[PDB]
């Protein structure tokens, strides 16, 4: 059984490395009965195009941002809301515990032919722009690229900007020409997708912390034996933990490289951004009241139950 794994990120990126190591484990443990090949750098298309391919079995596995899964499986949008997690460490507790399992299961048990197996870390997303944004007010009227999810367009509009949905690969040229004034992402993406060449101001809003599911086509999943399925579950969960260490290293390295390239990291009070997005959490969070209560209550400890 052959697995093609699609990635939007370039070779060497922390997700890519963790995933190729996971694939090596699959090959070794199955004595070659499962083979694995990585297709990085967006060679198999945009994240939305790849998810479509996974649904019909043309691509066997991928990792994508949860941001673009929302339009396919609405119930995952609980993790896509602005400031749903208080910080990066809080998100990690969630994806490692019971609520993380529940949300993976909402993808798997959906009618959309995907099996969700683990969560990769993509840090926190902050706004980078061609001109400095030092306050909520400075964002007014700016065209900021977001991922293709109505939630993020509403979010950016609530912050007084103009959210423009675009595929990952379209951002570089749109920035170069001023078709957009900025975008929002973590430091490794800002660096490794070369967006810093056009945007030298990075405002640390941390407005989203979007986990990234690793998914398999359910068509492919159903061709595995139960023992192979257990192997896949095991090594996917191991990859969630391995990628965390790679992520922390890469994020810190990327921050330093970006500063050396002349990117200014601008600290801001998050409160005005939190307040501006209350309407978005009210709109999209109405049906997630219980989950939000449970998420908010995860704090000092590291329990599984939440
Ligand atoms: O915003 C984006 O397009 C990209 O953001 C990065 O942070 C994610 O790791 C990647 O999966 C997304 O495709």
- The ordered H/E elements are EHEHEHHEEEHEHEHEEHHEHHH
The hetero molecules present are: beta-D-glucopyranuronic acid
- Stated plainly, the CATH topology is called D-Maltodextrin-Binding Protein, domain 2
Most strands sheet = 6 strands, mixed
* Count of structural domains: 1
Count the strands?
11
Give the structural class: alpha/beta
Q: For this structure, what is the CATH class?
A: Alpha Beta
CATH architecture: 3-Layer(aba) Sandwich
Strand percentage lies at: 15-25%
Helix segment count?
Answer: 12
PDB class: transport protein
Keywords: trap periplasmic solute binding family, enzyme function initiative, EFI, Structural Genomics, transport protein
Assembly: monomeric
Entry title: Crystal structure of a TRAP periplasmic solute binding protein from Pseudomonas putida F1 (Pput_1203), Target EFI-500184, with bound D-glucuronate
